[PDB]
Amino acid sequence: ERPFSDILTSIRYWVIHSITVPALFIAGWLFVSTGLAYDVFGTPRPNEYFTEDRQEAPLITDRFNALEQVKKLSGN
Amino acid sequence: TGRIPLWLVGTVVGTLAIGLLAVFFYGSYVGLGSSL
Amino acid sequence: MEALVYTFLLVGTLGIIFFSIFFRDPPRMI
Amino acid sequence: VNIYGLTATALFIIIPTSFLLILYVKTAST
Amino acid sequence: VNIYGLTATALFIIIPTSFLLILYVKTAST
Amino acid sequence: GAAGAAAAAGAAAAAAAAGAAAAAA
Amino acid sequence: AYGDSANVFGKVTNKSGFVPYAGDGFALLLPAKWNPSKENDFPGVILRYEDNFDAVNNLVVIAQDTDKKAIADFGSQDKFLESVSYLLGKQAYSGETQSEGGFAPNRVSAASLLDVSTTTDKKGKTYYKYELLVRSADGDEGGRHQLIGATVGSDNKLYIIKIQIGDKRWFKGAKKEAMGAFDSFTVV
Amino acid sequence: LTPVDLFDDRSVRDRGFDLIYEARDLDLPQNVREGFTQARASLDETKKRVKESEARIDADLDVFIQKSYWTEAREQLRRQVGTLRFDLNTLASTKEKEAKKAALGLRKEFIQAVEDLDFALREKDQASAAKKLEITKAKLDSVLAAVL
Amino acid sequence: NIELALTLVSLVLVVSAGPLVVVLLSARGGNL
Amino acid sequence: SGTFNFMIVFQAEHNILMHPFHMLGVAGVFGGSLFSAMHGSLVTSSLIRETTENESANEGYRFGQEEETYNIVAAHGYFGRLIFQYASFNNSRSLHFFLAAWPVIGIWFTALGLSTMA
Amino acid sequence: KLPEAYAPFAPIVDVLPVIPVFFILLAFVWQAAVSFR
Amino acid sequence: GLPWYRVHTVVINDPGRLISVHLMHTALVSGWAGSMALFEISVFDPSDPVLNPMWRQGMFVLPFMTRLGITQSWGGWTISGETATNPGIWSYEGVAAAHIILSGALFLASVWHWTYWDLELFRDPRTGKTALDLPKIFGIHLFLSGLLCFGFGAFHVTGVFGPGIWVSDPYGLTGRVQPVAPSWGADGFDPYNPGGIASHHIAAGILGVLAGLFHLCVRPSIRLYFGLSMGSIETVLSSSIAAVFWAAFVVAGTMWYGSAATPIELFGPTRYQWDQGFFQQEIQKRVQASLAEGASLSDAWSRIPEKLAFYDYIGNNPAKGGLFRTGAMNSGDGIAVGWLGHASFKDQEGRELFVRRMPTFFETFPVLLLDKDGIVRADVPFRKAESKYSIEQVGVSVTFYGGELDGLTFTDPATVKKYARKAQLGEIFEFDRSTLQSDGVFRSSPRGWFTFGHVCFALLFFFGHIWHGARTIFRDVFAGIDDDINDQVE
Amino acid sequence: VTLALDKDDPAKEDSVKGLRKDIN
Amino acid sequence: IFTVRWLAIHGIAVPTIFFLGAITAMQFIQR
Ligand code: CLA
Ligand code: CLA
Ligand code: CLA
Ligand code: CLA
Ligand code: CLA
Ligand code: CLA
Ligand SMILES: CCCCCCCCCCCCCCCC(=O)OC[C@H](CO[C@@H]1O[C@H](CS(=O)(=O)O)[C@@H](O)[C@H](O)[C@H]1O)OC(=O)CCCCCCCCCCCCCCC
Ligand SMILES: CCCCCCCCCCCCCCCC(=O)OC[C@H](COP(=O)(O)OC[C@@H](O)CO)OC(=O)CCCCCCCCCCCCCCC
Ligand SMILES: CC1=C(/C=C/C(C)=C/C=C/C(C)=C/C=C/C=C(C)/C=C/C=C(C)/C=C/C2=C(C)CCCC2(C)C)C(C)(C)CCC1
Ligand SMILES: CC1=C(/C=C/C(C)=C/C=C/C(C)=C/C=C/C=C(C)/C=C/C=C(C)/C=C/C2=C(C)CCCC2(C)C)C(C)(C)CCC1
Ligand SMILES: [Fe+2]
């Protein structure tokens, strides 16, 4: 039953996947365009790479105290 | 089953797959990672 | 000295190539 | 040119060469 | 301790040792 | 931003209308 | 994690290719693709940026305290550069050679002064600006262009800028980054 | 350990040094880079080289022909003469429209005399090249009596 | 930017114009 | 070692690793080594029991025999459950064309990639 | 650029070179429409 | 008949020849152990244990005898650097002979089990065919294993009856064989605690006895008999090969990282001690302990042991080697003779300078002289045409403190560059390239060679686990598949 | 003159003295 | 429909269209 070619040619597939598929594309568009992707993953925005303390690349350089150090490297 | 033709699905879905790929080459020359 | 050893290993490899072609175990059919 | 490598080359030849010759001439006579 | 005598001893062993082993294991399988 | 959601909500209601334009037929 | 929106469909903030800088007593516009180097070549270095691509392309400012109030008090421009000739380095090869081509005997490097000027700013202080091409016996980068400019500030301190650009990069667009940084150098 | 040495080369840029640096920055137009704008903007620099070009033709090209120096006469006609086509258009584009056709018509036949002198110098025909040169100098004076 | 927008309109009217032949010829007639 | 100098100097002057035709050539020799091990193991794992455990299984094939010494249906029906059923080749003639065309087309590109960087 | 009596038609011209890539794709649409017979 | 790679499977069916063929392998392994220990004693140079120790000389199995108490020899010498007044029977040569005598005894036992293969013990009752009771056989051998484990831990290591193991200080200076006490807290799992080794083998020895008593009595499940194929002598081979590569990753892992079971006076320092500045920090900790109490420079650097300065050297780093740079570490840079001092660098502005040491990756590394705050001030430049950090212009002099060049200063710009390129390699030493005709490029320690074998063996034994686990689960289809096997598709 | 920390910083910089407590 | 074949495709296809919406908005982030 349903061998991958009566699904793609069925209209009930496209009365679902012309609504959920664009609303999921827009959900991915708004995850980044609202800046939330910069906050969840901690990637710096293009105005966040260099604070006034440092003008160089960060260096973690400390194992067990890295959690509060990367807060100081990022500038929070 | 057969309500829409499979070749018209594969044309249209293939077109905005080539169309989405052209956005990835458009965005490779402008904005982030454009070297300008 | 080692160049004598190098050529002996190269001549010896080309010897096995000569025997593997002209003295191969012939494929018997049926 | 060392004492090791000149005879390690000769042992890596002759000990596996002759071992395979022991098994082949055993087999080719059967 | 020379390069000759240490490997001439090893060749006078292994080249006639294995030759006799080629002929024996040929024969003992017959 | 807003215009990234305005034309997004436009085709969210256009494909809902065009998806119903053939669902009424 | 402060939530600021991503710059979708937005206007750029810097296409000038220059970043304004303000140290202590001076201000200049650095080449925007250059980054700070942790090197002190010379006594008196305040900042020293180098290119990200190769470390030959770099600039450096030098603030020496002096007893003189005007740059004319150091003599003329020809007598000034021979005092500050340490900017071009030192020949660390005191070997004897006559097989290097286009040089004097025992010289594996030969600086050539190409331009001088006496430009000023809106404050009134005159500068001594220089333009050299320092060739070497191996001839790396096709030579090295030097952009030396010097002045004494309002605190009796000699501010010297030196922009070094390899000649290979000079005709390929590092003249625009260097001259734009060299003209922007103003000591307040 | 010795310092590096300076040399007074502040007048090489006044003569000819900063000329290959103008031909390598890709921000200038190519008419500025190839030397085409500077020839059109200053009329006297073309008027200098055109009088110099006939000094290379009326005096310097026959000498290689009686001694039959062909590859020094083929390239005498291309080295400093190698701007004369571009120069004789700039000096002819300063005239009236019925004077420009008189100028470019004389300029067109001097081209046909040099290209016939070149072919005479190409098959090493000394009896023809010494004859094609006197035609070439006559068509040269007809252009230079029109555009300057 | 109208010069960029017309280039997109000229793209869509042509990128459809090939399958427009194939769709129409499939519906009416059918000798493809 | 002269080859190794040729490769190292090539990557400095032409950046061969970042060229897509060398990327396709690596995909042809990594795919061609994957597919050699893939096709080589499915055939080896589908051999009909012809010999005992005291003699090699390579004795079970006779040169010139007209029967077919392994089970293509069992080989296809194994790679079908391994990833997907329609992701396999039930056609052994279509299998061996793809087995030839993946290295040959990949090396065709890296031969042209080297010739475009020429 | 084009002659200025044709420069409003320059948006159409930028689409014109890629058209023979669509001609090889149209052979695949036509063969998909007959189901690759 | 059989192929060449399948000849040893004549032993899979009869257990008597399986005894005889493991006995011959056991005779060869202990026959190697005595023969390698005789070879290492015949080439070991026990003269300088401070600056030419056993790991410096290429001794591989001599640090394994010395790890478990054997410190004395029948030539008078010891390891700690004194004369043995009573070597006893358990010398190095006594143990090298005890493995050869065992090698011939195991040899004769293998000849016995080869001829008398058809023992009644190997045939089970009331079926009469050769069979082995592998759950109980495992229960016997696990019981003996935990009995030796508890015996080695409570008696040999703890020093209750045996001698003990090697214990040293953190810095590899004062190291002996002394008994340890077991440590039963959380401290016993710190692997640099030797007390956790004794506390291991007691606790794992007792549990291995109690587990052995389980597998002697409780027969396995039937569902777990078939699922692990217990009736085959190869499902114990696959699981044992799985046991011995697991062990060989742990064993080579603790050898490379260092542990209390791998002392650095026996196996050399680790690569993480050069990288993390382990001995350099302590050498500076002892100079600053003397400059703070009131002392001179040259009187403080003399108080550092010459053995401690030898650990702070890139040539004794095990990761500065080569795969075919064969032999002793002394064959590379020479036999170390004396510590040549501590090179201290000053320029013409009276500022100290510090050579950036060669990192472990670098075959070659440019010499840089940095200040206190970490800024490069002098180097040996590659281009000398227009330099600005040359030693000649900066005016770098070098003074030594302690060692053979104590109180001696070098201002010659050729001499200073020679010792600046030796100071990136660590502390400065004087070698001899004439005693062994040394090549000039470093080797790896036995700590690096042991790790190389026992990860290459642990990785090849992953494949042997894969092969022999596959031959048990797929034992019925080893010679091929059935003809009607087409029911597995739709 | 020099601490043991900023002697092992310009010489090795991977030092276990220089890496720990380096939040200052 | 929540079957194994449904969870196989939509484990792949649902985040794929989510990231393709994300990556497409990244082409228009200027700076
Ligand atoms: C009882 C007789 C006996 C004794 C006292 C010794 C004593 C010694 N041998 Mg010799 N040896 C013997 C028999 C003996 N050997 C035999 C029969 C063989 C042939 C197999 C060898 C082969 C041999 C070699 C090849 C070497 C030695 C070495 C040594 C020395 C150090 C041992 C060492 O560090 O091992 C360390 C031992 C271990 C780490 C044990 C590993 C066992 C693992 C950890 C257990 C895993 C399985 C276990 C069952 C798991 C369950 C545990 C629990 C649940 C029950 C020491 C002098 C070394 C040496 O310096 O000699 C020159 C050396 O290199 N021996
Ligand atoms: C895992 C077990 C283990 C291991 C590897 C070692 C290893 C070692 N122990 Mg320790 N020990 C252990 C368990 C262990 N011990 C236990 C359980 C005890 C408590 C009983 C002790 C108590 C102990 C003491 C008290 C001493 C050692 C010593 C030694 C060292 C020398 C022993 C040797 O090399 O024998 C190697 C032996 C063989 C390879 C077997 C040889 C077989 C012989 C030669 C065959 C012939 C037998 C006989 C002579 C003939 C009989 C004749 C008859 C037929 C008439 C070595 C480091 C000694 C030491 O370090 O002193 C410096 C020492 O004094 N051990
Ligand atoms: C209170 C009692 C006590 C005490 C103090 C100890 C103390 C110790 N035990 Mg023992 N032990 C005890 C009871 C005790 N044990 C009992 C009752 C058992 C059950 C029989 C064991 C079983 C046991 C085992 C099986 C092991 C120890 C180990 C250790 C050591 C741990 C520290 C160490 O070296 O880590 C080092 C060891 C590890 C970090 C183990 C991690 C294992 C890794 C994951 C294996 C990696 C290989 C794997 C295939 C991964 C693929 C390769 C990879 C590169 C991708 C230490 C000596 C370990 C040891 O001897 O190490 C030398 C060890 O392997 N113990
Ligand atoms: C796990 C096993 C092991 C380990 C770690 C060591 C470790 C060590 N041994 Mg010992 N040794 C062992 C087993 C081991 N040995 C065995 C089994 C024997 C008996 C043959 C010896 C005999 C022996 C002697 C006689 C000597 C050493 C020496 C050494 C040291 C130098 C290592 C070296 O040069 O490597 C060399 C490593 C390589 C060349 C890389 C091997 C890579 C593969 C195996 C090459 C094979 C490829 C190819 C098929 C070979 C064909 C080429 C042909 C021309 C030969 C080192 C401490 C020397 C030493 O310092 O003693 C003081 C020394 O003189 N060993
Ligand atoms: C405890 C370890 C162990 C044991 C007991 C066995 C035992 C067996 N294996 Mg397995 N195997 C192992 C490890 C082991 N293997 C590992 C680690 C691998 C991965 C390389 C394999 C891969 C393997 C394959 C692929 C096959 C076997 C086969 C066999 C069987 C016959 C072996 C034979 O005739 O060799 C004959 C070998 C020779 C005549 C010469 C081999 C010479 C090589 C080059 C080694 C040189 C010897 C060297 C001096 C010793 C150093 C070894 C080192 C570990 C110390 C036998 C049941 C065969 C089988 O199952 O048959 C049905 C088979 O096809 N084994
Ligand atoms: C690629 C790896 C691999 C593969 C394919 C096999 C395949 C096989 N093994 Mg082997 N095995 C492996 C690795 C592997 N093993 C390792 C690393 C070990 C430990 C040394 C073993 C130990 C082992 C034993 C002791 C036995 C087998 C057996 C078997 C067979 C039956 C299947 C089975 O029980 O698997 C074993 C199951 C697994 C490998 C899956 C376990 C994975 C768990 C869920 C992960 C837990 C790790 C944890 C969550 C991560 C935290 C640590 C992290 C920080 C690093 C089969 C031939 C049996 C056999 O031969 O029967 C005939 C048997 O007796 N294996
Ligand atoms: C000089 C070359 C470069 C040097 C290379 C050195 C390394 C060589 C390595 C390879 C050695 C040979 C491998 C095994 C070959 C084999 O089994 O053949 C099998 C065939 C059997 O075929 C059968 O032989 C029958 C005769 S009989 O059965 O053998 O009596 C015959 O009747 C029948 O027609 C035929 O089918 O052998 C022959 O045909 C003739 C016998 C070959 C004898 C071995 C030669 C050994 C090499 C010596 C060469 C000189 C070396 C010194 C100078 C450098
Ligand atoms: C005591 C110290 C240790 C001494 C050890 C001495 C003995 C060691 C002998 C080991 C060698 C045995 C190998 C026999 C090899 C052999 O007999 O092949 C045949 C063999 C199996 O063939 P069959 O299954 O048909 O067996 C039939 C029987 O007649 C074989 O006994 O193939 C393999 O076992 C797999 C490995 C083959 C690998 C072949 C070589 C592949 C690489 C070629 C490299 C050169 C070309 C590439 C250059 C770029
Ligand atoms: C009879 C007898 C006797 C004697 C005994 C003896 C004498 C013994 C010996 C023994 C021996 C003398 C042994 C030896 C052994 C050795 C070995 C066993 C080796 C091996 C090797 C190997 C195994 C190797 C491997 C490898 C290679 C190949 C290379 C490198 C890598 C590796 C390592 C892997 C007596 C009189 C006492 C009395 C009693 C009886
Ligand atoms: C713990 C201990 C120890 C050790 C011990 C041991 C380890 C032992 C071993 C033992 C052994 C290990 C033994 C063995 C034995 C063997 C035998 C006894 C064998 C015999 C054989 C035979 C008798 C054979 C015969 C024959 C021949 C020759 C040929 C022909 C056939 C026949 C079979 C008849 C010590 C001392 C340290 C101290 C004390 C305690
Ligand atoms: Fe095939």
Could you tell me the CATH number of the domain that includes residue A70?
A: 1.20.5.860
L300 phi/psi in degrees, rounded to 5? -90, -40
Helices within E1-30 (DSSP H only): 3-28
Task: Note whether K26 contacts I19, CB cutoff 8 Å.
Answer: yes
Contacts 24+ apart (CB under 8 A), J35-39: J35/J98, J35/J99, J35/J102, J38/J79, J39/J95, J39/J99
Task: Note whether I15 contacts B15, CB cutoff 8 Å.
Answer: yes
| Interface membership of L386 toward H (CB under 8 Å) | yes
Task: Note whether K33 contacts I15, CB cutoff 8 Å.
Answer: no
Only one residue has tokens 């031909």, namely H23
Residue N10 marked in a binding site: yes
Biggest CA–CA distance in chain B, Å, is 51
Q: Is the CB of L235 under 6 A from ligand 6?
A: yes
The CA-CA-CA angle for residues L195, L200, L204, to 5°, reads 165
DSSP reduced 3-state for L178 = strand
Size (chain K), residues? 37
List the G186-187 sheet strands across, edge first: G18-22, G26-31, G186-187
- Which residues, 6+ apart, have CB-to-CB distance to L203 below 8 Å? none
Closest in A26, A28, A33 to N19, CB measured: A28
DSSP reduced 3-state for G150 = strand
DSSP reduced 3-state for G134 = strand
Structure-block tokens of residue G30: 């650095």
Tally of domains in chain A: 1
A53 phi/psi in degrees, rounded to 5? -70, -55
Query: Cα torsion at G135, G139, G141, G145 (round to 10°)?
Result: 0
Query: What number of helices (H) and strands (E) belong to chain N?
Result: 1, 0
Task: Note whether A55 contacts G36, CB cutoff 8 Å.
Answer: yes
Which among L7, J1, L337, L481 has a CA at the least distance from the CA of D27? Answer: L7
- How far is H40 from H18, CA to CA, in rounded Å? 20
- How far is L457 from L246, CA to CA, in rounded Å? 11
Cα–chain center distance at I21 = 8
Helices within I1-32 (DSSP H only): 2-15, 19-27
The CA-CA-CA angle for residues G79, G82, G84, to 5°, reads 110
Query: Cα torsion at L13, L15, L21, L27 (round to 10°)?
Result: 170
- How far is H10 from G165, CA to CA, in rounded Å? 19
With contact defined as 3+ CB pairs under 8 Å, the chains touching E are: D
G129, G182 Cβ separation under 8 angstroms: yes
Report DSSP state, residue L54.
G
Only one residue has tokens 């140290």, namely G23
Only one residue has tokens 């160049």, namely C3
Cβ contacts of B11 on chain I, cutoff 8 Å: 19, 22
A36-56 in b/e burial notation, b at 16+ Cβ within 10 A? ebbeeeeeebeeeeeeeeeee
- How far is G155 from G147, CA to CA, in rounded Å? 24
Cβ contacts of A6 on chain B, cutoff 8 Å: 1-2
Structure-block tokens of residue L343: 């090179």
- For residue L447, the surrounding DSSP H or E stretch is helix L446-473
| Interface membership of A24 toward F (CB under 8 Å) | no
- Which residues, 6+ apart, have CB-to-CB distance to K9 below 8 Å? K2
Structure-block tokens of residue A46: 């293009």
Domain ranges, residue L104: 1-270+444-490
Listing DSSP states for L378-422 in one string gives: EE--S--SSBSSBHHHHT-EEE--SGGGTT-EE--HHHHHHHHHH
R_g (Cα) of chain M, nearest Å: 8
Tally of domains in chain L: 2
Structure-block tokens of residue L421: 């390129």
Q: Ligand 5 pocket by C-beta < 6 Å: which residues? A: L 4-9, 237, 241, 460-461, 463-464, 467-468, 471
Task: Note whether D1 contacts C2, CB cutoff 8 Å.
Answer: yes
The residue type found at L279 is F
Structure-block tokens of residue B17: 């797959």
H91, H47 Cβ separation under 8 angstroms: yes
Q: Which residue of L has its CA nearest to H4?
A: L386
Q: Which residue of K has its CA nearest to I27?
A: K33
Q: Alpha-carbon torsion G63, G67, G71, G75, what sign?
A: negative
- For residue L175, the surrounding DSSP H or E stretch is strand L175-178
Atom of ligand 10 nearest to the CA of L106: 12
The residue type found at L456 is C
Listing DSSP states for L182-207 in one string gives: ---SGGGGSTT-THHHHHHHHHHHHH
Task: Note whether I7 contacts K14, CB cutoff 8 Å.
Answer: yes
* CA-to-CA dists, residue L33 to L38, L39, L164, angstroms: 9, 10, 21
L427, L310 Cβ separation under 8 angstroms: yes
Listing DSSP states for H51-113 in one string gives: HHHHHHHTTTSSHHHHTT-STTTTTTTTTTGGGHHHHHHHTTTTS-HHHHHHHHHHHHHHHHH
- For residue H139, the surrounding DSSP H or E stretch is helix H126-144
- How far is A40 from J2, CA to CA, in rounded Å? 51
L238, L228 Cβ separation under 8 angstroms: no
| Interface membership of D9 toward C (CB under 8 Å) | yes
DSSP reduced 3-state for G115 = strand
Structure-block tokens of residue L203: 């606790």
Cβ contacts of I9 on chain K, cutoff 8 Å: 11
- Across the strands, what pairs with H62? none
The CA-CA-CA angle for residues L344, L349, L353, to 5°, reads 30
C-alpha count within 13 angstroms, C-beta hemisphere, residue H34: 7
* CA-to-CA dists, residue K26 to B18, I26, L62, angstroms: 14, 14, 78
L153 lies in the same domain as L14: yes
Experimental method: cryo-EM
Domain ranges, residue H40: 1-148
Q: How far is the CA of L459 from the centre of ligand 5 (A)?
A: 14
Structure-block tokens of residue L7: 């000849």
| Interface membership of L382 toward D (CB under 8 Å) | no
L353, L370 Cβ separation under 8 angstroms: yes
- For residue L377, the surrounding DSSP H or E stretch is strand L376-379
- Which residues, 6+ apart, have CB-to-CB distance to H44 below 8 Å? none
Which among L282, L333, L296 has a CA at the least distance from the CA of L445? Answer: L333
Task: Note whether L486 contacts J54, CB cutoff 8 Å.
Answer: no
Residue J32 buriedness (CB in 10 A; 0-12 / 13-18 / 19+):
middle
Q: Which of G47, G86, G90, G97 to substitute to test the interface with L, most L CBs within 10 Å?
A: G90
* CA-to-CA dists, residue H23 to G171, G178, H45, L483, angstroms: 9, 18, 19, 81
DSSP reduced 3-state for L271 = helix
Task: Note whether M19 contacts A65, CB cutoff 8 Å.
Answer: no
Q: Distance (Å) from the C-alpha of residue A30 to the closest C-alpha of chain B?
A: 17
- Across the strands, what pairs with G149? G129, G161
- Which residues, 6+ apart, have CB-to-CB distance to L33 below 8 Å? L61, L96, L99
Q: Which ligand is nearest to the CA of C25?
A: 7
Q: How far is the CA of C22 from the centre of ligand 7 (A)?
A: 10
Structure-block tokens of residue L4: 């060449």
L286 lies in the same domain as L320: yes
Cβ contacts of K12 on chain I, cutoff 8 Å: 6-7, 10
L342-369 in b/e burial notation, b at 16+ Cβ within 10 A? bbbbbbeeeebbbbbbbeeeeeeeebbb
- How far is L156 from L180, CA to CA, in rounded Å? 10
- How far is J106 from L152, CA to CA, in rounded Å? 61
Residue L265 buriedness (CB in 10 A; 0-12 / 13-18 / 19+):
buried
Only one residue has tokens 């001030």, namely L377
- How far is B18 from B24, CA to CA, in rounded Å? 10
L165, L180 Cβ separation under 8 angstroms: yes
- Which residues, 6+ apart, have CB-to-CB distance to E15 below 8 Å? D14
* 3-state SS string for M1-24: CCCCHHHHCCCCCCCHHHHCCCCC
Tally of domains in chain H: 1
Q: Is the CB of L89 under 6 A from ligand 10?
A: no
- How far is H17 from G132, CA to CA, in rounded Å? 13
Name the residue at shortest CA distance from atom 3 of ligand 9: L104
- Across the strands, what pairs with G111? G134
Cα–chain center distance at H89 = 12
G27, G123 Cβ separation under 8 angstroms: no
- For residue G35, the surrounding DSSP H or E stretch is strand G34-36
- Across the strands, what pairs with L72? L78
Contacts 24+ apart (CB under 8 A), G64-69: G64/G157, G64/G158, G64/G160, G65/G156, G65/G157, G65/G158, G66/G152, G66/G156, G66/G157, G66/G158, G67/G156, G68/G152, G68/G156, G69/G152, G69/G156
Helical pair D3-28 and E3-28, crossing angle rounded to 10 deg: 10
Which among K12, K34, A70, L15 has a CA at the least distance from the CA of L23? Answer: L15
Which among G178, G58, G166, G69 has a CA at the least distance from the CA of G129? Answer: G178
Which among H132, H129, H118 has a CA at the least distance from the CA of H78? Answer: H118
- For residue L429, the surrounding DSSP H or E stretch is strand L428-430
Q: Which residue of L has its CA nearest to M5?
A: L281
- How far is A66 from A55, CA to CA, in rounded Å? 20
* CA-to-CA dists, residue L450 to G148, L61, L161, L326, angstroms: 60, 10, 30, 14
C-alpha count within 13 angstroms, C-beta hemisphere, residue G159: 21
- How far is B32 from G8, CA to CA, in rounded Å? 11
Biggest CA–CA distance in chain C, Å, is 51
Domain ranges, residue A8: 1-76
What residue spans define the domains of chain G?
1-188
Q: Is the CB of L21 under 6 A from ligand 2?
A: no
J55-85 in b/e burial notation, b at 16+ Cβ within 10 A? eebeebbeeeeeeebbbbebbbbbbbeeeee
Helical pair L235-257 and L446-473, crossing angle rounded to 10 deg: 160
Q: How far is the CA of L469 from the centre of ligand 5 (A)?
A: 14
L167, L180 Cβ separation under 8 angstroms: yes
* CA-to-CA dists, residue J21 to B18, G62, J13, J28, angstroms: 21, 50, 16, 10
Q: Alpha-carbon torsion L19, L25, L29, L34, what sign?
A: positive
- Which residues, 6+ apart, have CB-to-CB distance to L382 below 8 Å? L366
Domain G1-188, what fold? Protein Transport Mog1p; Chain A (3.40.1000)
DSSP reduced 3-state for L432 = coil
G130, G106 Cβ separation under 8 angstroms: no
Structure-block tokens of residue L19: 């005894």
* CA-to-CA dists, residue K8 to I3, I6, K2, K12, K18, angstroms: 8, 10, 9, 9, 20
Q: Is the CB of L108 under 6 A from ligand 10?
A: yes
- Within 10 angstroms of residue L146's Cβ, the number of other Cβ atoms is 21
C-alpha count within 13 angstroms, C-beta hemisphere, residue J76: 18
Cβ contacts of A26 on chain N, cutoff 8 Å: 21
* 3-state SS string for J50-113: CCCCCCCHHHHCCCCCCCCCECHHHHHHHHHHHCCCCCCCCCHHHHHHHHHHHHHHHHHHHHHH
L167-183 in b/e burial notation, b at 16+ Cβ within 10 A? bbeebbeebebebbebb
| Interface membership of I21 toward B (CB under 8 Å) | no
Which among L130, L111, L109, L107 has a CA at the least distance from the CA of L119? Answer: L130
- How far is L354 from M15, CA to CA, in rounded Å? 14
Structure-block tokens of residue L267: 């196996």
